[PDB]
Design a protein around this ligand. Structure first.
Ligand code: AMP
Ligand code: AMP
Ligand code: GLN
Ligand code: GLN
Ligand code: IUM
Ligand code: IUM
Ligand code: CL
Ligand code: CL
Lengths: 495, 497
């Protein structure tokens, strides 16, 4: 879904509403199902839905029973069932939407219920009674959210920067693990955990069976949906586990892998799918198909980062292929490397202290990284991506085991392999460019054509911020800028 | 799907290729499934697909076995199976696509096979051997297609004017029942029928069974598909007729309206009668209101009537697609065929009637075909219209027009399909003073226009909209958005005055 909100209105609200319709529509690929808008003299909440749960009645914006509170959410509240039970006493549910609990929660706790939600999301809520608003983003910013200001000082928020660039003088990412309560006027962090610090877990007790079961429960809970769903299977450990787990609790399970015809990963993926027994779909794309998509990928992910761009491409095309099949949601394996210190550089880790701090740090930066890519790549085509490895509960267990246990002094994510070896082929289980070498190669080769050594030499004059230092980056930048003129838009991009 | 083509290339081909992507992308809603493209120094063909038939190998552009011929099509060729059979001994089919047949016929007939096809389509074919191209559009302009030229003379073709406006100096609709063979350089009409003239059918007999059978067959042929499809049910005669036949030969049905509308009611009835899985789609006036701009952009017209009518269709499609349906059948064409409108009550004689129907069929491309196609297409949904099938048209257009004369409007049709439906339905007349979708829709549309357009703006319209000046506040409202979206003079001119 997409969310779009305008707060602190100081102008013709009428005109603003007309404009909101326009800007919201810019993100309609995220919510192809239906459009919703709420507009008053003091606030606007525009919504583009992708119905996953409560098809018929999960229409948004969701309204107060009394109709004084209005909510627009992009996300999934996994524990909503539990919450309905708990507050159902106090609040009158109007639908079956998982998102409705935020409305219950707010009614009783005001702005203080963020850590009570389990799931991924971004929302904007408007209380006509108190003439107040609340904006929030999940714990690690799994669901993206941007914010910015008009030349009037009016406040804007949108799932994608794409809808703000046209009106804001400034924009920035809506901080993850946080909320914005109008009465307070300041963004406050709500997500904190003991494990944020080493000295907190340092001599903890690792419980493998706990770890495994934790990931199982995460997956299980992320299976919530009223539409057809699938799993991304790349043949890598992370998606192999997710798919394995998913297969395990699916009770027809579709798997998807993407790549240049004949590439290695494809083979791995096929192997796993065959071992797990899923109805696999090997998506192929040609190098030219990828080239031709670059610009749109860039418009979708909203970045000029080479690596992200190179990687979102395939994902972007896989998504179009999935959606065409009719699948609206998929589970993926992002977060695993960050939780378990999956990177090779982690092999090189100095000690458990260093390891821990790095992973934490990595977890806290994901909203700008893997999260953004997955979400936006998939949403380009109206496909929802779930990340069980990043589930709230799971993380507490995985971040709380002893971090020595994460040290490679073994395969990189040993403990994890150990936990699921049984579910997989020995090959993936203990394995340590699969989409196609040619993919990045032509990429590079095309950049070198399109970019003069001259351009590169004086890039600092053109792109003073995060000056591109290679012709490929140079190329992605030009397009980025072309699409996202505003100077702060590039500052959202990690320097 | 969508088709985008550029021919007679006099500039940097590389350059142009980049632009084609850009422009082709503007119509992606019509072919969300996948994208394809062929680019050379002399021709570009870009396609956005909506896979209905042969999902796995039906990709486009479609190529020649020798890869010397390239074809890009938006359409459904109903008699393709028969053709494959007819021409398989000469042409090696590379796919299961109903559309590849065009490649085969072009191979054995050059540009003279247009009337061999039975279906709806718009296509562009480029022959790298001969360095030539051929553009064609179905018999009544069922599927849309625009043409235009560059400041350099380069020629463009596109399913929607939206893809041309940004680059052409001039533009126009690619003529219906026509083709453009590059070797000719002139657009030629290929469709003509004796029934085009009254003296041709004046003494004809009327075959009820013949007529029933013909509609039946058309529908049967129209069910051709590899994906899930449905029917658009209004509860009105036409759509009810279509629906019943589909049920019998084939089932999800769809109706749209304001909570409480006549259409919604009537459709429920029929759905009940037929036993289809019925989906009643509601919309609110504000949702309708909020969609106007998109609607104008999708349909590419400023015509008040069409806009009114297409809004609900566009919202309905959004929903059908959310349910996963890619194709549906519609009852459009019936009234034009049987003289089903109220005005037809006042027809002086069969001649005037017959003559009037013909006119109507031949203008459809600017009207109802446009709405039907373009409204559904805004959400990647394909609309089929059995009543306008070529072969059906030949039977229906050839019966005694005197049988078209109106006790009830479409009596014959009723007599013919009486069996299928609940009599209440079959002999259901239309009423002036009742709005299917809900009276509030227009009422609000008018209301909004009045409030947004000044008397003066209206009085001075001519200084602003010198071509087909809007004569009402509503017309003005729509025209203003239109112009705003398609800033090119000839665009406005494609819209029938
Ligand atoms: N060919 C592919 N097919 C399906 N999913 C893929 C493919 N390549 C990558 N992914 C997904 O991307 C996830 C996280 O990205 P990463 O771990 O950064 O490679 C994997 O754990 C998979 O769910
Ligand atoms: N309310 C509706 N719900 C579903 N389909 C509709 C509805 N109204 C019209 N249609 C379809 O559109 C066709 C042509 O409409 P018309 O051109 O207005 O007579 C019908 O005969 C139906 O297939
Ligand atoms: N697209 C989304 O963000 C999903 C919203 C909500 N869970 C629904 O399925 O309606
Ligand atoms: N979208 C269309 O015009 C359909 C083209 C062809 N019939 C197919 O199913 O691929
Ligand atoms: O997450 U690998
Ligand atoms: O048929 U109008
Ligand atoms: Cl800002
Ligand atoms: Cl022209």
């Amino acid at each position: 879904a997409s969310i779009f909100g305008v707060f602190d209105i100081k102008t013709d609200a009428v005109e603003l509403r007309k404009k909101a319709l326009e800007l919201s529509r810019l993100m309609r690929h995220r919510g192809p199902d239906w459009s919703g808008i709420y507009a008053s003299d003091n606030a606007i909440l525009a919504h583009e839905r992708l119905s996953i749960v409560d098809v018929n009645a999960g229409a948004q914006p969701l309204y107060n029973q009394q109709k004084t509170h209005v909510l627009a959410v992009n996300g999934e509240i996994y524990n909503h069932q539990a919450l309905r039970a708990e507050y159902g006493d106090r609040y009158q549910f109007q639908t079956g939407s998982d998102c409705e609990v935020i409305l219950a929660l707010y009614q009783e706790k005001g702005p203080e219920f963020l850590d009570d939600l389990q799931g991924m999301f971004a929302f904007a809520l408007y209380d006509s009674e108190k003439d107040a608003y609340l904006i929030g983003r999940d714990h690690l910013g799994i669901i993206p959210l941007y914010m910015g200001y008009d030349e009037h000082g009016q406040l804007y928020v949108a799932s994608e920067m794409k809808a703000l660039v046209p009106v804001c003088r400034t924009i920035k990412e809506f901080p993850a693990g946080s909320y914005l309560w109008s009465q307070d006027g300041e963004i406050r962090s709500y997500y904190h955990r003991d494990w944020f610090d080493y000295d907190a877990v340092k001599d903890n007790v690792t419980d493998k069976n706990e770890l495994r079961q934790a990931l199982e429960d995460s997956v299980k809970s992320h299976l919530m949906s009223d539409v057809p769903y699938g799993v991304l299977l790349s043949g890598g450990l992370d998606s192999s586990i997710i798919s394995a787990i998913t297969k395990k609790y699916a009770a027809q399970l579709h798997s998807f892998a993407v790549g240049l015809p004949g590439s290695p990963d494809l083979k791995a993926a096929q192997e796993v799918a065959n071992h797990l027994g899923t109805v696999h779909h090997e998506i192929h794309f040609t190098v030219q198909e990828g080239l031709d998509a670059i610009r749109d990928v860039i418009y979708h992910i909203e970045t000029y980062d080479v690596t992200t761009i190179r990687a979102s491409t395939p994902m972007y095309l896989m998504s179009r292929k999935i959606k065409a099949m009719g699948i609206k949601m998929v589970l993926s394996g992002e977060g695993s490397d960050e939780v378990f210190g999956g990177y090779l550089y982690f092999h090189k880790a100095p000690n458990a202290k260093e390891l821990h701090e790095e992973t934490v740090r990595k977890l806290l930066a994901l909203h700008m990284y893997d999260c953004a890519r997955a979400n936006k790549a998939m949403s380009a085509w109206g496909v929802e991506a779930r990340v069980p490895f990043l589930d709230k509960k799971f993380l507490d267990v995985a971040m709380r085991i002893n971090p020595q246990d994460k040290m490679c002094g073994k395969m990189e994510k040993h403990i994890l392999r150990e936990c699921f070896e049984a579910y997989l082929p020995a090959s993936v289980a203990w394995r340590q460019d699969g989409v196609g070498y040619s993919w990045i190669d032509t990429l590079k080769e095309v950049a070198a054509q399109q970019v003069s050594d001259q351009q590169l030499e004086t890039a600092r004059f053109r792109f003073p911020y995060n000056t591109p230092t290679s012709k490929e980056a140079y190329l992605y930048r030009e397009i980025f800028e072309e699409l996202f003129p505003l100077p702060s838009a590039a500052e959202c991009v990690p320097g």
